[model samples]
Target chain A: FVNQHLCGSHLVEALYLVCGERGFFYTPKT
Target chain B: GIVEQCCTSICSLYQLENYCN
Candidate 1:
């Protein structure tokens, strides 16, 4: 699956910013 | 606690802007 078409990269930074360190760290939903 | 991206690398930046706080 390495060659699979990647639509996007997981925005760990954005997620963290949106959810906050505590919220993003523990939240199961993204 | 600084810096903001306008429509450069990713379009999601706009969405993030709204939710950035």
Candidate 2:
């Protein structure tokens, strides 16, 4: 699973940044 | 599993040194 790869604080921090309310998405190539 | 250590530290070091400069 993706969760297994992330591991510990790295996973939590990455998820928080991805799901946080202020998150914005950009498709640079498309 | 093994860490790849090499005597070419000098060469790698030179590359990084020159690249930085």
Candidate 3:
């Protein structure tokens, strides 16, 4: 996949930003 | 909270991958 989304951010950045401020705001969908 | 519950769901998956890779 190319730059898919994970949570509210792009999965492309998941490795870096995912654990940063962006992922900090992550909340799962119901 | 359910967040903790859901978190582990994915957390397990990620941990599995972390363990896998």
Candidate 4:
């Protein structure tokens, strides 16, 4: 799924933000 | 109407990211 590349990097940041509001949260590997 | 409405909504939000920034 990582290779799918449908969404932009910014969306991934947004997903990381809003995910907590939806009861799940995560951070990308550094 | 391609996928379920809920998934569509999520995808819609994914598109929304473009608008925010």
List DockQ for all candidates. Answer: 0.08, 0.03, 0.05, 0.05
Evaluating just chain A, the predictions reach TM-scores of 0.33, 0.45, 0.19, 0.37
Q: Give lDDT tens digits, candidate 4, residues B1-21.
A: 212221223455543332332
TM-score of each: 0.25, 0.31, 0.19, 0.27
Real contacts retained, model 1: 0.05
> Could you arrange the candidates by DockQ from highest to lowest?
1, 3, 4, 2
Residue-wise lDDT of candidate 1 within A1-30, one digit each (tens)?
A: 211221224344554555564443322233
Query: Residues B1-21, candidate 2, lDDT per residue (tens digit)?
Result: 001111112122222122121
Query: How many angstroms is residue B2 displaced in model 4 relative to the true structure, after the best TM-score fit?
Result: 12
Per-model lDDT: 0.36, 0.29, 0.32, 0.36
* Highest TM-score against the true fold, candidate: 2
lDDT of 2: 0.29
Give the poorly placed runs of model 2, Cα more than 4 Å off.
A1-4, A22-30, B1-21
Give the alpha carbon lDDT tens digit for every residue of A5-29 in model 4.
Answer: 2234644554455444453322222
The C-alpha interface RMSD of every prediction is: 10.8, 16.1, 11.6, 11.0
After the best TM-score superposition of candidate 4, give how far the Cα of residue B21 lies from its true spot, in angstroms.
24
What's the lDDT of the predicted structure labeled candidate 3?
0.32
Q: Looking at candidate 2, what is the lDDT of residue B13?
A: 28
Better of 1 and 3 by lDDT: 1
lDDT of 1: 0.36
